[PDB]
Amino acid sequence: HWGYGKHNGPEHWHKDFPIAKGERQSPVDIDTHTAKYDPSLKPLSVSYDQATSLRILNNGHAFNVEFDDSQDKAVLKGGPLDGTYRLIQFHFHWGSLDGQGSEHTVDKKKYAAELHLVHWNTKYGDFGKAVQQPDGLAVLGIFLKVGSAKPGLQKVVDVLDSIKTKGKSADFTNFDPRGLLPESLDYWTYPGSLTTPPLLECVTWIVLKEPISVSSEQVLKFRKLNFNGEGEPEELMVDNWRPAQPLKNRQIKASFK
């Protein structure tokens, strides 16, 4: 099925998933000069102190850090949202080179990686139902640039050799995702989609203005992961990003001047 290679990558996805050419696909380029400041946009409310991480999984396209979402433990509200959204997992997209890796771009500029914290709207009861709704998900996107290390990321980096290949998982309890956040919660927001198949148009994107910096060693270790399963020929997990998609009718709003 689908992947990030020349024969199964983003240019191929529309054959299995026609919505790939839809009207609200993600990611997009964020043209900062055309995004309009909205003084009515509320501050984001990120309540992560009761977050309960469980497990980290190599699913063959990225690694997911999963949380207990059976209860309102770690939630996203406010900002452009009018509901409560539970954190279910986070993951990254990254490049083979420091100059590429992010899915969203800012004035056509690419970051080395992008963090997605994935939340679903509790009025729909579970994640499976939520992705079938236009307002089912809220994804907090955070850019990574290469520079100084991010201490709050190191526990993630540390465990990656225990989940080198597709289908491997490891215990990952007591991880605090607050350690992955930049100082500012200033953001851009627009309506979009999952950036991987099935590419459902169910996401309110909230992309933070301020990137976090990670060390070259930290992203280096991301790139030692494998797309393949154990015992299969090694394919390095790199360049697992979808490129920017046409903005079409949409307007990106900024929480800040």
Ligand SMILES: CC(=O)OC[C@H]1O[C@H](S(=O)(=O)N2CCC(OS(N)(=O)=O)CC2)[C@H](O)[C@H](O)[C@H]1O
């Ligand atoms: C339809 C549905 O129930 O979930 C959508 C898909 O995605 C999640 S995921 O936990 O791996 N993950 C969720 C959303 C992530 O999208 S992201 N890149 O835009 O915000 C990527 C994959 C799972 O992989 C599911 O197997 C897969 O079906």
Ligand SMILES: [Zn+2]
């Ligand atoms: Zn993602």
